[PDB]
């Protein structure tokens, strides 16, 4: 069993965030896997940490493993803008032949137990407030208002839909309001 | 990446695991709020399905369309059966995962994404415009909008969120152009192949 | 499987004779020694996980160089394989105690073991250290009776002699 | 070859399991009945010549065509070979009884015995009749009911060993 | 057994023909590449234990059912038999590479190997996997592309010898 | 087919060993001597018809009694068979030069040739005359190089010794 | 003593035949490769003391555990015997280079070495480390020509494979 | 069996010494004369039957009692045994010449040959005469001084190989 108690953690860019995952186990030897689920839901392997190994490190990714406390909390360092995902603490015992139940299974049949995941949002770094340039987009009885604005506080009728605030690659925010002005 | 099928029907879950020396294929369900959990694994050599305890046989079947190919079959679909499914096989350092397909089970229209196109002032101001493409009333919400050039195969394009309109969904995307940049749309329901939208200068 | 019964029956079959007084006498010895044999076997079966853990820990403590890169214990995977090997040997020792002879050990853990360990860079000294630790760790009458201890230590010494 | 203990070990090895408490209890029961088993083996081997000769003679008397020309017991050479093969079958049955397992019987006697007898022209039905008469005589000797031989043994139930001997003889008959 | 020259002679003997100019030129190419062939055979044999142990270990790592109870690599006896078979296959592959012909391999190792493995219960898929890993490692040693062991040879192209080693290993895999 | 490569590989297989330094060294000798023996093989393959006809003429000139009735060569069919046999032997000599060993000769022209020739009244002296004429007829560097001549005459002498 | 000459002569004797073209070809290979292998032998003979010292130092640096009590090398006498064993192996490698085959190695250092090292608790990995260091330490042509290096490394790899 | 290189190694092994510079130079001389040695071996083997017939016929003509009744060469069976023995001795002498060492001859032909001949009644004087005539013919063929057949070789002094052949034949004579 895996217990990721906290989800939706927030941490800025170029920062370090520690994702605290616990686990319950009756296995003498095991491994702990750390997966990030992309918005495309592509479960991606990040780092492998075993029960009887030194705390794992994969460059940016690192683990602070515990045996008695069973705290194998992954730590990410120097976060990039495209590092936000749903991070899963995966407890499995693939390459283990001794110290598990007495079943006749050859560890290729062994399931990888997952925690409920922790979503990470990589907020941009603190920086001087930026004035947004506004263009209102219209083509065929449809109005879309795209707004260089920091923080996420632009605070911008057949139907008007929820504006979408996204972190621009420029280390800032860009927003679109689509519906059938400036306040930042 | 998405599979929409009515209740009391059959859903085919293919995936892209190109593993050749596989011996077991595990099928994980992530129900987007719980942990990804195995329903069964497919014994590749012996062609057996091992359902986890407390389940009922005849709910999950692993089909072998080709050599190194697998598909999960779901009989008498219910809404609880909805989620995201992965085929997982153990690799040397980890467990490899397929791209993952989303199975939405609806009770039982043209739910293709309707392309609303906003050809863009900005080139007067910043000599760099943007093309934003809107796709409305599609089902399911599982969609993928990315932008490419006519010359090459994934340009960094800002992507807004998805919003339910009444019972279908809406989603847009724009690409801050510093040429004919196309807007590839990947949805389940399209005009069989995935969608695509042109944009002129 | 090398045992009292199988040895006597094989000798009689090679001579093409019915079981004689000596064969029944040998089986009587099997009967008498079975008490200690099966006591040791049952204790080992009930406490093998702890015994295997202790043997592996002693093996890696006496030879920390195994954890060096390019050595047999250079990863958690093959450290667990070392513990699994010790478990295999202890299970074969349990089988030998149940059987009454080295048959299971001879056929399943000793035959070809030298070639495997040479080919896989597994020093026999590490196995020997694990089994020596298991043998010298056994306490009488705490762990088993004196004669069950004789059977258990005899199986371990047989494994050690097969490795050295 | 395997005995009862080695059979239990092999069954445990298929599961990579230490010999369980149930298997250990079964082998302890085997040991506790070990004196009875030794007496049963002694009963069979002390009358082995009688058992084999009586069974061959009964097989011939029920099937007189065996000693007729072309019959497979005609020609004292063939009669001696028949008595020898019956004695071999009883010897391996006694091995199985002593071991508590039929592995020695099948592996060293019954493997290819059917094919060998087919090639030789040895009648399967007459061989089965001889093996069955050996079964009855050996069972009687185990239970000391043999009307013409009383082996002094302590009073008790040896019907388990008698059933074991019957099962070994049935395995011989089904092999051919 | 045959070598490349013996193969050419056998082919010529079929038509009662003296060895033609084209076959003679092919064998002259074989001789002119003979130093490269000796380089290749030396690279294989100097790493034979490496190749065989790595191939068997990889076959086991991809298929841990082989070392599970009932698997064909469980029981150190079976493990040593598997390592011995890998060594024998690599030895006959090296014989074929040195000879320039697969006759020695096909006649002394592959002859009856498939039915032997079927009777023994040796899994053909796992054996093919082990032989394929041996092929990859041997070819890497021929081309001196092994990451952890480089053998010094004069710069040149031994892709013909690597292809020949791969052909012998593919013959081994197809035989089973 | 006995040759350098086959001899060394067969010895290694009998000893169950990988090709060692000695095997590669023998193959290197094959490489060194292949030039001479293949030159001899090429010359023989290119001029075998004249060589065979001429060896047959020498054989029948030394033994004109072979044309007498009841003798080998008493008919044009048997004379043509004589020339065909000399052609077979020259082709096997070419094969021996190609492989670098007596293998082709041993297995295809020498083995059983004694029994065949005794049964068919083919005197070995006639074959020996043909091959001795071929051997002594060769001229250096007139017909081939010195070492090609050495290999060609060695093959011929091997055939002669097999016939005498 | 396995060499080119002994292998071919033994094959001919087993077949009961005189030396033929293939045997002389193999001895020609002896002639061709003798320059390189004898250069390697001469260099090893002239610099064996320092080579053996370096190999033993590398062996004991790779496995310092050998100095622990109860292990091979826990006394100065045992370390001296380790260096003497490496000297014996290098002398046998020099003998193999001179001979042209693994004969001297097979008969004098390899045969029975498995049993000797198992009985005396001599880990083969230590010998393997010494010989691997000697093989990788060799430089072309700083230490010897390319082909002499090939023969020297081939003998060393043969010893290593005999040990693994 | 030992060759010249193996003989040098064995001599060096007795002192636990690496092969000395003088021994290496002697073996280099052996290699430089290696083409001469192959020349000599070819000359002997190409005339092996010639030499054996020469020797046995000369031994018989010098001692006509060998073919008289009771003689050891009378009875075509004994005559063929004599020819076979001459061929075997010449074959082992050629082995020694090719190896440059008497080890193969001593260990495989002469070991126990004297006692075997004494038990069989083979006359040691006549056998020695045959061996000496073989020595003369083989020496003539080494030096290409055989009156009836000449073998084309490059001009040079092969007296060392001729003396080696003579030494091997005299060793045969001493053994008997
Ligand atoms: C089937 C085989 C079998 C064995 C070989 C033992 C091995 C073994 N011994 C101990 C554990 C122990 N073993 C001993 C025994 C001794 N310590 C000494 O110093 C004395 C020389 C000796 C007799 C008093 C003691 C005192 C302990 C408890 C403390 C310890 O861990 O050492 C433990 C840990 C669990 C426990 O028993 O508490 C194990 C696995 N047990 C088995 O089941
Ligand atoms: C039925 C009986 C039976 C056994 C007894 C074992 C024996 C055994 N061990 C290994 C395999 C192995 N065993 C070990 C164990 C060791 N690690 C160390 O540090 C020590 C030196 C040593 C134990 C003391 C290691 C390390 C490997 C793998 C070698 C490698 O490639 O690193 C293998 C090869 C297959 C595999 O990879 O699992 C086998 C057959 N297996 C069996 O089936
Ligand atoms: C082809 C040649 C050939 C033979 C020579 C005979 C030999 C022979 N005799 C008997 C069998 C027998 N033979 C006898 C004969 C004897 N009774 C006496 O009082 C004397 C001592 C002795 C001869 C005078 C008896 C009595 C039996 C029956 C044995 C029994 O079942 O008790 C049997 C066993 C089968 C049977 O019951 O018939 C055979 C093979 N049969 C052959 O096929
Ligand atoms: C030299 C070898 C050798 C043997 C042959 C046996 C003989 C033997 N049998 C039994 C003991 C026994 N033997 C039998 C046997 C039988 N009783 C019947 O009524 C059946 C007809 C028959 C079945 C075969 C029984 C039933 C017992 C149990 C009696 C008891 O244990 O008190 C005992 C224990 C003491 C006794 O009760 O006498 C011994 C030593 N043991 C040996 O070591
Ligand atoms: C000259 C040719 C030559 C060969 C190629 C082998 C072929 C061969 N292999 C085995 C025997 C065996 N071979 C294997 C090997 C294998 N098990 C696996 O899991 C792998 C897939 C595979 C090797 C890659 C095993 C495990 C056995 C023992 C089978 C058993 O006892 O159940 C046997 C039976 C005798 C023995 O056990 O040694 C033979 C003849 N032997 C030869 O002489
Ligand atoms: C008795 C033992 C014995 C051997 C072991 C070989 C050793 C050997 N190899 C080559 C020669 C060679 N060896 C190789 C080998 C290779 N080079 C690469 O880059 C590839 C990775 C690899 C393919 C196998 C090549 C390509 C040559 C040709 C170079 C040349 O001839 O100059 C030569 C010729 C001269 C030289 O270059 O040194 C010799 C003597 N010959 C023998 O007689
Ligand atoms: C591959 C084997 C091989 C041989 C054995 C020779 C054999 C041979 N050479 C010649 C051909 C010839 N060869 C020579 C040369 C010589 N004259 C002598 O007396 C010397 C011994 C020798 C070197 C000076 C001459 C002079 C002729 C023509 C005359 C003749 O037939 O003798 C002929 C006659 C037909 C012809 O070729 O024109 C024959 C059969 N050729 C071959 O291809
Ligand atoms: C017969 C076998 C044979 C060998 C295996 C070597 C082994 C060897 N190398 C060195 C010693 C040395 N050997 C070299 C040569 C080289 N060092 C490198 O790192 C390069 C890869 C390579 C070619 C440049 C060097 C540079 C030294 C001195 C530095 C050192 O000790 O590393 C020494 C000490 C004496 C000396 O200084 O030469 C010895 C015995 N020598 C032999 O006689
Ligand atoms: C006990 C029985 C027995 C025999 C059967 C003969 C058989 C026999 N004959 C000869 C020996 C001989 N036999 C012949 C006979 C022949 N001359 C011809 O012109 C024909 C071709 C042929 C008869 C048809 C000749 C010529 C020799 C001498 C061979 C030679 O030295 O050239 C020899 C060799 C010894 C010797 O030189 O005498 C022997 C063993 N000798 C025996 O001891
Ligand atoms: C590997 C070594 C090797 C040898 C050297 C021979 C040695 C040898 N020679 C003979 C046997 C013989 N050897 C001779 C030979 C001789 N008679 C003479 O008059 C001559 C003086 C002399 C040869 C020069 C004879 C005549 C016999 C037969 C004697 C007999 O059967 O009475 C035998 C007994 C078996 C047999 O008859 O073949 C043996 C072992 N054989 C071998 O295998
Ligand atoms: C595989 C088969 C094979 C052989 C059969 C030999 C054949 C052979 N012999 C020599 C070479 C030689 N052969 C002889 C032989 C002799 N000269 C005389 O005058 C004496 C009568 C006689 C003594 C035996 C001599 C003296 C040389 C030296 C000439 C030289 O090397 O240039 C050479 C070197 C080149 C040459 O000059 O021809 C070769 C290749 N080598 C081989 O590789
Ligand atoms: C005259 C042609 C003839 C025969 C021969 C027999 C042969 C024979 N013996 C039997 C059965 C049999 N036979 C013996 C052997 C017996 N015990 C001894 O110790 C002595 C000395 C014996 C030899 C005579 C025993 C002990 C039994 C067990 C059953 C019994 O007889 O009570 C059975 C019965 C098998 C069954 O139950 O199906 C037969 C048919 N019958 C015939 O019709
Ligand atoms: C931990 C479970 C495990 C293994 C064991 C290996 C087993 C293995 N070795 C391979 C392949 C392989 N192996 C070697 C040998 C290797 N290279 C060297 O330089 C030396 C000294 C070596 C000793 C080990 C070579 C040279 C190759 C060629 C390919 C390569 O590695 O580049 C391949 C690929 C075969 C193919 O191409 O199909 C496998 C699967 N892999 C695993 O996952
Ligand atoms: C008529 C009773 C009779 C004989 C038979 C011979 C037998 C004979 N041949 C010899 C010696 C001998 N024999 C041959 C073989 C011979 N030479 C050739 O060139 C070819 C092709 C040959 C085939 C026959 C050679 C080469 C020699 C070497 C000495 C020489 O002839 O010059 C020697 C001398 C041995 C010595 O030197 O001690 C003798 C006695 N002599 C006799 O009195």
Q: What would the 3-class secondary structure string for C27-79 be?
A: HHHHHHHHHHHHHHHHHHHHCHHHHHHHHHHHHHHHCHHHHCCCCCCCCHHHH
For residue E144, give the nearest of E161, E131, E126 by alpha carbon: E161
Give F107's DSSP letter: I
Helix axes G21-46, G4-14, angle to 10 degrees: 150
CB atoms within 10 A of CB A119: 14
Cα dist from H48 to B136, H45, H83, H90, H96, whole Å: 101, 5, 11, 7, 15
Q: What length is written for chain A?
A: 184
Q: Which of F49, F54, F87 to mutate to test the pocket of ligand 7 (most atoms within 8 A of CB)?
A: F54
Provide CB contacts within 8 A for G115, sequence distance 6+.
none
* Residue D131 and residue D169 in contact, taking contact as beta carbons nearer than 8 Å: yes
Which chains, if any, share at least 3 CB pairs under 8 A with chain D? Answer: A, C, E
CA dihedral D166, D171, D172, D175 (to 10 degrees): 160
Beta bridge partners of A56: none
Backbone φ/ψ region at A167: left (φ over 0), alpha (ψ -120 to 50), beta: beta
* Residue G74 and residue G67 in contact, taking contact as beta carbons nearer than 8 Å: yes
Beta bridge partners of A144: A137, A178
Query: Among all chains, which residue has been given the structure tokens 């990721």?
Result: A4
H5, H88, H108 member nearest G100 (Cβ)? H5
- For an interface test with G, the pick among F2, F9, F17, F21 (most G C-beta atoms closer than 10 Å) comes out as F21
Which chains, if any, share at least 3 CB pairs under 8 A with chain G? Answer: C, E, F, H
Find out whether F148 is annotated in a ligand binding site. Answer: no
> Can you point out the beta strands (E) in A64-107?
74-76, 86-92
3-class SS at B162? strand
Provide CB contacts within 8 A for H102, sequence distance 6+.
H96, H167, H168, H171
Cα dist from H146 to D140, H11, H138, H150, H155, whole Å: 93, 37, 9, 6, 16
Do the Cβ atoms of E78 and C112 come within 8 Å?
yes
Residues of E with a Cβ under 8 Å from any A Cβ are: 64-65, 67-69, 71
For residue C85, give the nearest of C119, C124, C47, C118 by alpha carbon: C124
* Residue D9 and residue C98 in contact, taking contact as beta carbons nearer than 8 Å: yes
Handedness of CA B178, B182, B184, B189 (dihedral sign): positive
E64, E69, E71 member nearest A107 (Cβ)? E64
Provide CB contacts within 8 A for B117, sequence distance 6+.
A139, A140, B133, B134, B197, B199
Half-sphere exposure of F132 (CA within 13 A, CB side): 19
Q: What length is written for chain E?
A: 176
Which ligand 5 atom sits closest to the C-alpha of E82?
Answer: 15
Give B37's DSSP letter: E
Cα dist from H50 to A151, F111, H57, H129, H148, whole Å: 110, 21, 11, 16, 11
H51, two tokens = 């030499």
F83, two tokens = 């020339």
State residue B185 phi and psi, 5-degree precision.
-120, 125
Shortest distance between the Cα of C74 and any Cα of chain D, in A, equals 26
CA dihedral B7, B12, B14, B20 (to 10 degrees): 130
D139, two tokens = 């069972």
Cα dist from E154 to B6, E139, E151, H64, whole Å: 68, 17, 10, 67
F58, two tokens = 């020498």
| CA angle at G56 for the pair G54 and G58, rounded to the nearest 5° | 70
Helix axes G76-99, G124-137, angle to 10 degrees: 60
G153, two tokens = 């490394």
Half-sphere exposure of A45 (CA within 13 A, CB side): 18
3-class SS at B47? coil
H42, two tokens = 């070819």
For residue C76, give the nearest of A32, A55, A50 by alpha carbon: A50
* Residue E161 and residue E40 in contact, taking contact as beta carbons nearer than 8 Å: yes
For residue B84, give the nearest of B27, B45, B125, B137 by alpha carbon: B27
Instruction: Please list every protein residue whose CB sits less than 6 Å from any atom of ligand 10.
Output: H 66, 72-73, 78, 81-82, 85-86, 88-89, 108-109, 113, 116, 120, 122-123, 126-127, 130
Q: What is the side-by-side order of every strand in the sheet holding B169-176? A: B114-118, B130-138, B169-176, B158-164
D109, two tokens = 């006697």
3-class SS at D36? helix
Do the Cβ atoms of A106 and E64 come within 8 Å?
yes
* Residue C41 and residue C154 in contact, taking contact as beta carbons nearer than 8 Å: no
| CA angle at D131 for the pair D129 and D135, rounded to the nearest 5° | 110
C52, two tokens = 């295997």
CB atoms within 10 A of CB H65: 14
Cα dist from A103 to A107, D14, H87, whole Å: 10, 11, 72
End-to-end CA distance of chain A: 46
Query: Among all chains, which residue has been given the structure tokens 């292990």?
Result: G71
Resolution of the experimentally solved model in angstroms:
2.0
Query: Is the omega angle on the peptide bond into residue G141 within 30 degrees of 0, that is, cis?
Result: yes
Element (H, E) at A121: strand A118-123
Distance CA H10, CA D125 (A): 71
CB atoms within 10 A of CB G115: 10
Half-sphere exposure of G145 (CA within 13 A, CB side): 12
Beta bridge partners of G116: none
Provide CB contacts within 8 A for G143, sequence distance 6+.
G43, G47, G149
A34, two tokens = 């750390």
Query: Among all chains, which residue has been given the structure tokens 């009687």?
Result: D140
State residue A11 phi and psi, 5-degree precision.
-155, 140
CB atoms within 10 A of CB F88: 14
3-class SS at B144? strand
D152, two tokens = 């002094």
For residue G87, give the nearest of G58, G54, G119 by alpha carbon: G54
CB atoms within 10 A of CB E120: 10
Across E45-77, b (16+ Cβ under 10 Å) vs e yields bbbbbbbbbbbbbbbbebbbbbbbbebbbbbbb
CB atoms within 10 A of CB D153: 15
For residue H25, give the nearest of G41, G100, G91 by alpha carbon: G41
End-to-end CA distance of chain C: 22
| CA angle at H83 for the pair H82 and H88, rounded to the nearest 5° | 95
Cα dist from A37 to A65, A89, A98, B4, whole Å: 22, 11, 31, 21
3-class SS at B33? coil
* Residue H52 and residue H87 in contact, taking contact as beta carbons nearer than 8 Å: yes
Distance CA H130, CA H90 (A): 11
Distance CA H121, CA G93 (A): 48
How far out from the chain centre does Cα A163 lie?
A: 23
B143, two tokens = 């969609």
* Residue H132 and residue H49 in contact, taking contact as beta carbons nearer than 8 Å: no
Distance CA B50, CA B69 (A): 18
Backbone φ/ψ region at F70: left (φ over 0), alpha (ψ -120 to 50), beta: left
Distance CA A36, CA A80 (A): 14
Q: What length is written for chain F?
A: 164
Distance CA A125, CA A130 (A): 13
Half-sphere exposure of C155 (CA within 13 A, CB side): 33
Distance CA B200, CA C21 (A): 104
E93, two tokens = 């592959």
Across A99-113, b (16+ Cβ under 10 Å) vs e yields bbeeeeebbbbbbbb
| Ligand 8 close to Cβ of residue G138 (< 6 A) | yes
Distance CA E113, CA E128 (A): 12
E13, two tokens = 């003997």
Distance CA F90, CA F156 (A): 9
């Amino acid at each position: 069993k895996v217990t990721q108690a906290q989800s939706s953690v927030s941490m800025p860019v170029r920062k370090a965030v520690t994702l605290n995952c616990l686990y319950e186990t009756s296995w003498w030897s095991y491994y702990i896997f750390w997966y990030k689920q992309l918005p495309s839901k592509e479960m991606i392997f990040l780092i492998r940490q075993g029960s009887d190994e030194q705390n794992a490190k994969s460059g940016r990714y690192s683990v602070n493993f515990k045996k008695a406390a069973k705290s194998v909390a992954l730590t990410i360092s120097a976060l990039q803008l495209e590092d936000s995902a749903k991070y899963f603490c995966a407890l499995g015992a693939p390459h283990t032949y001794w110290g598990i139940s007495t079943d006749l299974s050859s560890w290729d049949t062994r399931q990888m137990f997952f925690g409920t995941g922790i979503k990470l949002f990589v907020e941009p770094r603190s920086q001087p407030h930026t004035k947004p340039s506004v263009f209102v987009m219209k083509n065929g009885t449809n109005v879309a208002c795209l707004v260089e604005f920091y923080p996420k506080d632009i605070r911008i009728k057949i139907t008007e839909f929820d504006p979408a605030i996204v972190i621009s690659p420029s280390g800032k925010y860009n927003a679109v309001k689509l519906g059938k002005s400036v306040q930042h | 990446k998405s599979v929409t099928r009515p209740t009391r029907s059959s859903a085919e879950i293919t995936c892209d695991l190109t593993v050749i020396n596989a011996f077991y294929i595990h099928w994980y369900l992530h129900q987007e709020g719980k942990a990804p959990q195995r329903l069964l694994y497919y014994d590749v050599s012996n062609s057996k399905d091992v359902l986890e305890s407390g389940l009922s046989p005849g709910k999950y079947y692993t089909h072998t369309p080709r050599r190194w190919s697998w598909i999960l079959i779901l009989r008498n679909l219910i809404e609880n059966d909805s989620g995201v499914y992965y085929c997982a096989t153990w690799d040397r350092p980890s467990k490899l995962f397929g791209s993952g397909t989303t199975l939405v089970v609806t009770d039982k229209a043209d739910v293709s994404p309707k392309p609303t196109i906003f050809l863009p002032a900005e080139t007067k101001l910043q000599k760099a415009g943007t093309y934003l493409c809107l796709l409305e009333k599609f089902f399911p919400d599982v969609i993928k909008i990315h932008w490419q050039e006519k010359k090459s195969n994934i340009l960094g394009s800002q992507e807004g969120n998805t919003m339910k309109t009444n019972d279908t969904y809406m989603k847009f995307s724009w690409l801050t152009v510093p040429k004919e940049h196309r807007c590839i749309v990947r949805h389940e329901n399209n005009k069989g192949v995935d969608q695509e939208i042109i944009f002129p200068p | 499987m090398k045992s009292v019964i199988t040895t006597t029956i094989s000798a009689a079959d090679a001579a093409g004779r019915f079981p004689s007084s000596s064969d029944l006498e040998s089986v009587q010895g099997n009967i008498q020694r079975a008490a200690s044999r099966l006591e040791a076997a049952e204790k080992l079966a009930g406490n093998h996980e702890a015994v295997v853990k202790e043997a592996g820990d002693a093996c890696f403590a006496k030879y920390p160089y195994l954890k060096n890169p390019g050595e047999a214990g250079d990863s958690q995977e093959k450290i667990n394989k070392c513990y699994r090997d010790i478990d295999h040997y202890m299970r074969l020792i349990n089988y030998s105690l149940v059987v009454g002879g080295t048959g299971p050990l001879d056929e399943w853990g000793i035959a070809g073991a030298r070639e495997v360990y040479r080919a896989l860079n597994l020093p026999g000294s590490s196995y020997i250290a694990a089994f020596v630790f298991t043998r010298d760790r056994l306490c009488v009458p705490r762990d088993m009776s004196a004669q069950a201890a004789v059977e258990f230590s005899g199986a371990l010494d047989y494994v050690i002699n097969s490795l050295c | 070859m395997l005995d009862a203990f080695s059979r239990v070990v092999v069954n445990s090895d298929s599961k990579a399991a230490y010999v369980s408490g149930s298997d250990l209890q079964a082998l302890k029961t085997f040991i506790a009945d070990g004196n009875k088993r030794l007496d049963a083996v002694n009963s069979i081997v002390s009358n082995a010549s009688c058992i084999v000769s009586d069974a061959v003679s009964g097989m011939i008397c029920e099937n007189p065509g065996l000693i007729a020309p072309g019959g497979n017991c005609y020609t004292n050479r063939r009669m001696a070979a028949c008595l020898r093969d019956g004695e071999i079958i009883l010897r391996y049955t006694s091995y199985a009884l002593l071991a508590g397992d039929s592995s020695v019987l099948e592996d060293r006697c019954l493997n290819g015995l059917k094919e060998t007898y087919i090639a030789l022209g040895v009648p399967t039905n007459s061989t089965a009749r001889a093996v069955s008469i050996m079964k009855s005589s050996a069972v009687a000797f185990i239970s000391n009911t043999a009307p013409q031989r009383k082996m002094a043994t302590a009073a008790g139930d040896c019907s388990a060993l008698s059933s074991e001997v019957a099962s070994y003889c049935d395995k011989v008959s089904a092999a051919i």
